[PDB]
A paper describes a structure:
Human [name] (hsGLTP) forms the prototypical [name] fold and is characterized by a broad transfer selectivity for glycosphingolipids (GSLs). In human [name], a glycolipid headgroup recognition centre located on the protein surface enables selective binding of the GSL head and ceramide amide groups via multiple specific interactions. Encapsulation of lipid chains within the hydrophobic pocket involves a cleft-like gating mechanism that results in two glycolipid-binding modes. To elucidate the structural dynamics of the [name]–GSL dimer and associated adaptations, we comparatively analyzed nine novel crystal structures of wild-type [name] (wtGLTP) and the sulfatide-specific mutants D48V and A47D/D48V complexed with N-lauroyl-containing monosulfatide (N-lauroyl-3-O-sulfo-galactosylceramide; hereafter referred to as 12:0 monoSF) and disulfatide (N-lauroyl-3,6-di-O-sulfo-galactosylceramide; hereafter referred to as 12:0 diSF) in different crystal forms and compared them with previously studied [name]–24:1 monoSF complexes.
Although the crystal packing differs in various crystal forms, we found a similar dimeric structure in all crystals, indicating the non-randomness of [name]–SF homodimerization. In crystal form 3, the four molecules comprising the asymmetric unit form two dimers similar to the original C2 dimer. Even within the same complex, 12:0-monoSF–wtGLTP, the θ angle and t distance vary significantly in the different crystal forms (68.2–80.2° and 15.4–19.5 Å, respectively), reflecting changes in dimer openness. In class 2 crystals, N is 2, 4 or 1, indicating the potential structural distinctions between monomers which are not related by crystallographic symmetry.
Numbering used by the authors:
A (entry chain A): 1 to 209
B (entry chain B): 3 to 209
The structure:
């Protein structure tokens, strides 16, 4: 874990445009969040979210100036691929990535807000389930949804998850949550803006895996 | 095709050349794309990962690791406490089980094994393979994950068509070709398992 208060996202400008370059650099630090769950069953997840970032970084690298914002990627790739857009290139990679980013976002906000099953307060299952539901559930068929619920056991204890995050520092659970809460700030704002862009561009697809 | 990329027959001393073992097995991971589902992508990725770790250790010194047995001999001397849960020994320890999964599964279909109520499914075949290669190394969470994924298995007819692809071969001619591949294949795997037993190189930990 890279320390997330050390890798804040940029604030939103008046025009709401997100610079691809700093965005990807920022989000490259996030896939290790899945190592903090403490189980090999989450490694396909880590690998899949990395995949997206890698693809967007690759496309970006081709021409940093033409793909300078995220809005650009969608515009330019639509000229490139025509009718096949948006199921293509970095538009497709950011479509799925924005969903995993929202999972991390809703999940952490949940843990920060103190949400919990009162019967089982050192579990993180209700936080995960809520995150999953409002970020991913909709784009998963029967099989992957059953795979999710199997995988929800083998989620760690809250205290252990929060201890896995805070690694390198000598920081308390409530201080760690302070650093997370500050991260969430431009993180949420930015994810929110990407979702609206997908809606405005008609780049959002509903197909299930 | 698995057909053409046959494994070499074993020599009488039973040592497996590391180079040529890696060439052969490297054709195998596209076995899971014959399953026609994204759910199998992480399986394919794990097997490929084993192959690569072995490929890599081999590459630091081809001559020191001419054989797979050589690999296990060297790495024992090299790590003591950590071995066999280390390096290419761990990679091959797991590769062999995926290899046995493929072996057992294809043998099952070739033998005509089927559920008579669902004869165009391959669920019984995959279960048998899973039970006799992998299941005992998975905890109940992972096993529950296998039983969910099993519903993404393709139909037998489609699965055999994917195996065939470019050919114009019957379902049966396809199977005929697979039987030929299984001969040298089963035997090499058998020998790898045996080497892991003689070397105390086997671990029974569950994931
Ligand atoms: C015997 C045992 C063997 C059984 C094997 C069974 C394995 C089955 C499990 C597979 C699930 C792994 C997660 C990744 C699934 C992915 O398939 C999907 C769609 O994946 C996308 O697909 C696109 C094409 O449609 C592009 O290729 C994308 O890529 S592109 O770069 O080409 O554009 C790619 O990410 N991603 C998504 O569902 C998102 C990833 C999952 C997010 C989950 C986060 C929350 C989880 C809760 C944590 C408590
Ligand atoms: C949206 C919801 C999110 C949920 C997503 C969760 C996805 C679930 C992930 C589990 C499925 C992936 C299969 C991989 C499981 C692996 O955990 C194990 C152990 O794997 C080994 O671990 C070692 C350390 O102990 C080394 O790292 C190995 O490697 S090393 O190279 O580093 O030495 C590594 O292969 N492999 C294995 O269990 C076997 C491989 C799979 C074979 C299965 C074939 C059966 C398929 C049936 C087809 C009909």
């Amino acid at each position: 874990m890279a320390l997330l208060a050390e890798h804040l996202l940029k604030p939103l400008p008046a025009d709401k445009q997100i610079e691809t370059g700093p965005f990807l650099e920022a989000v490259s630090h996030l896939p290790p969040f899945f190592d903090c769950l403490g189980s090999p069953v989450f490694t396909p997840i880590k690998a899949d979210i990395s995949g997206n970032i890698t693809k967007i970084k690759a496309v970006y690298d081709t021409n940093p100036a033409k793909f300078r914002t995220l809005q650009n990627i969608l515009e330019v790739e639509k000229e490139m691929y025509g009718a096949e857009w948006p199921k293509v290139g970095a538009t497709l990679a950011l479509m799925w990535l924005k969903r995993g980013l929202r999972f991390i976002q809703v999940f952490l906000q949940s843990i920060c807000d103190g949400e919990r099953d009162e019967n089982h307060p050192n579990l993180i299952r209700v936080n995960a389930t809520k995150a999953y539901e409002m970020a991913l559930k909709k784009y998963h068929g029967w099989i992957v949804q059953k795979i999710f619920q199997a995988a929800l056991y083998a989620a760690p204890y809250k205290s252990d998850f929060l201890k896995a995050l805070s690694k390198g520092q000598n920081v308390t659970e409530e201080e760690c949550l302070e650093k997370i809460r500050l991260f969430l700030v431009n993180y949420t704002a930015t994810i929110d803006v990407i979702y609206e862009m997908y809606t405005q561009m008609n780049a959002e697809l509903n197909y299930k895996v």
